[PDB]
């Protein structure tokens, strides 16, 4: 909740989980170097055993929004998360209807 911006900054299809996944992408952008350091100290077997156990405990106290595995692409037209095409940021269905209308550049009905 503390990561949810008090002023909406989304211009696409807004949703409960769309706004929740956008707040996770910004939290990780600010903590990637700091999170990449803890992951580097945990794997460096040359550092003291205490330095690795400390860096290992701090990485557990990080907020869930900071974890990059939480990020899941969603549809910018329907807010779904299942069947999203990375090249278009939409579900397989929305891609079809827009591809036939000509809204997606270059796409073409395949026949061969």
């Amino acid at each position: 909740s503390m990561f949810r911006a008090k002023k909406l900054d989304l211009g696409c299809f807004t949703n409960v989980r769309v706004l929740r996944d956008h707040s996770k992408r910004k939290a990780f952008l600010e903590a990637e170097p700091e999170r990449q350091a803890l992951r580097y100290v945990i794997r460096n077997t040359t550092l003291p055993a205490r330095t690795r156990a400390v860096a290992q405990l701090q990485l557990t106290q990080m907020h869930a929004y900071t974890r990059p595995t939480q990020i899941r692409n969603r549809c910018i037209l329907g807010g779904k998360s299942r069947g999203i095409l990375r090249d278009f940021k939409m579900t397989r269905y929305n891609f079809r209807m827009n591809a036939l209308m000509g809204n997606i550049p270059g796409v073409k009905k395949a026949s061969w």
Binding site: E32, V41, P48, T51
Partner: protein
């Protein structure tokens, strides 16, 4: 009695000039200056390529808009005044005519005639001269800080600010794991 006379031949001939258009002139003009700003920002030995990489660095500071010297001279003075006054960031004008249009359209709004000296040197240093910081070679592996700089300095993925967030946390862990 409500009758509207059809358009006369004189009126029709007048509408054509507006809708269809008239026979205007066209003066061919092509010099390296008219092409300057569109060239390839390559770091070649030819000065033409280096002068284009220094202009590309001015467009990045000015907002990042392409070089368009053929699509008018208009702009948004309200947004250029805020960026120039309240944000204190540079502004890039594709032509002198676009600079004078922002002046005469804002009530007593003055812009600087070119950048400052310190800003001209910062541009030529990295974009043209390309003065870098050679990542030194680390022999021993136990040198954590010296080895991290080696990697951070050998990739444009880590920006000067990202390398700070990393080193801040790193130094905090190394110091917190000692007797």
């Amino acid at each position: 009695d409500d009758y509207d006379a059809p358009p006369t031949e004189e009126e029709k001939a007048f509408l054509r000039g507006l809708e269809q258009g008239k026979v205007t002139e066209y003066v061919p003009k092509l010099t390296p200056d008219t092409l300057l700003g569109y060239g390839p920002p390559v770091a070649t030995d030819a000065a033409l390529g280096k002068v284009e990489s220094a202009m590309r660095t001015m467009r990045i500071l000015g907002g990042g808009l392409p070089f368009n010297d053929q699509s008018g001279v208009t702009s948004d003075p309200t947004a250029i005044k805020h960026r120039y006054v309240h944000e204190k960031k540079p502004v890039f004008f594709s032509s002198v005519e676009e600079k004078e249009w922002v002046r005469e359209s804002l009530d007593k709004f003055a812009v600087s005639e070119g950048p400052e000296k310190k800003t001209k040197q910062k541009i030529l240093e990295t974009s043209v001269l390309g003065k870098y910081e050679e990542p030194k070679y680390v022999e021993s592996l136990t040198e954590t800080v010296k080895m991290v700089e080696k990697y951070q300095g050998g990739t444009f993925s880590y920006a000067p600010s990202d390398a700070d967030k990393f080193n801040k946390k790193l130094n905090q862990l190394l110091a917190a794991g000692l007797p």
